[PDB]
C-alpha cells in the first residue's frame, strides 16, 4: 500500500520463497550463490525499514509500534531461515 507496507510484503514473500525452496532441496546446489545474495539484500532491506521507522518516530503524530512489530517479525523469519539454509547437509 504505502511504500513501507509494500517492502514488508515483498520481504516476507521473498523469505517465504527461499524457505519453500529449502524444504524441497534440503541437501548441501544450483541456487546456493543466489540465496546468499538475496539474503544479504534482505538484511540491507531491513536496515532501510528500520531507518524509515527512525525518521517516522520523530513525527509525534505517528505511532510506529505496528511497523516495529512487523520488522521484528521479518527479522525472526530471516533468522529461522538462515539457520535452515546453514544446516543443509
Amino acid at each position: 500500500e504505502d511504500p513501507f507496507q509494500q517492502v514488508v510484503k515483498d520481504t516476507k514473500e521473498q523469505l517465504n520463497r527461499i524457505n519453500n525452496y529449502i524444504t524441497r532441496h534440503n541437501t548441501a546446489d544450483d541456487q546456493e550463490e543466489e540465496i546468499q545474495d538475496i539474503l544479504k539484500d534482505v538484511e540491507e532491506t531491513i536496515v532501510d525499514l528500520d531507518r524509515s521507522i527512525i525518521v517516522m518516530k520523530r513525527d509525534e503524530n505517528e505511532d510506529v509500534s505496528g511497523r516495529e512489530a512487523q520488522v521484528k517479525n521479518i527479522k525472526q523469519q530471516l533468522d529461522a531461515l538462515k539457520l535452515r539454509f546453514d544446516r543443509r547437509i
Partner: peptide, 22 residues
C-alpha cells in the same frame, strides 16, 4: 526457476524516495 520476487527492487527504491520526502 528464479527465486527472486518481482518488483522487490523497484519497491525498495520507492521506499528510499519516500525516505527523502520525509
Amino acid at each position: 526457476k528464479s527465486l527472486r520476487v518481482s518488483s522487490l527492487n523497484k519497491d525498495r527504491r520507492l521506499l528510499l524516495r519516500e525516505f527523502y520526502n520525509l
